[PDB]
């Protein structure tokens, strides 16, 4: 469990009237190959 440098993404969505509706930060779920090469990633997930 994390308690505390930049591997996150800013995710943006706009509607028809050019207005940003989400503008949120997000992090990518690991791929199963990454889990295969590092099983501790499943624990973090």
């Amino acid at each position: 469990i994390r308690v505390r440098v930049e591997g996150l993404q800013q995710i943006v969505l706009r509607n028809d009237q050019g207005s940003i509706v989400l503008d949120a930060l997000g992090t990518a779920a690991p791929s199963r190959l990454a889990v295969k090469l590092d099983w501790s990633r499943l624990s973090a997930w």
Partner: protein, 47 residues
């Protein structure tokens, strides 16, 4: 009596050539099963 046979054809002559070219549907399938194929096997049962 005007056209000389050794001068070459005076009509329209249809040349041809074979070409290697995959269709869009075939390429989409290839992406599915060779680059976007993340099935559990082929990942974890590869040994």
């Amino acid at each position: 009596n005007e056209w000389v046979p050794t001068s070459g054809p005076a009509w329209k002559v249809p040349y041809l050539e074979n070409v290697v070219k995959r269709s869009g549907r075939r390429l989409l399938a290839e992406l599915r099963i060779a680059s976007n194929n993340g099935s559990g096997d082929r990942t974890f049962l590869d040994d």
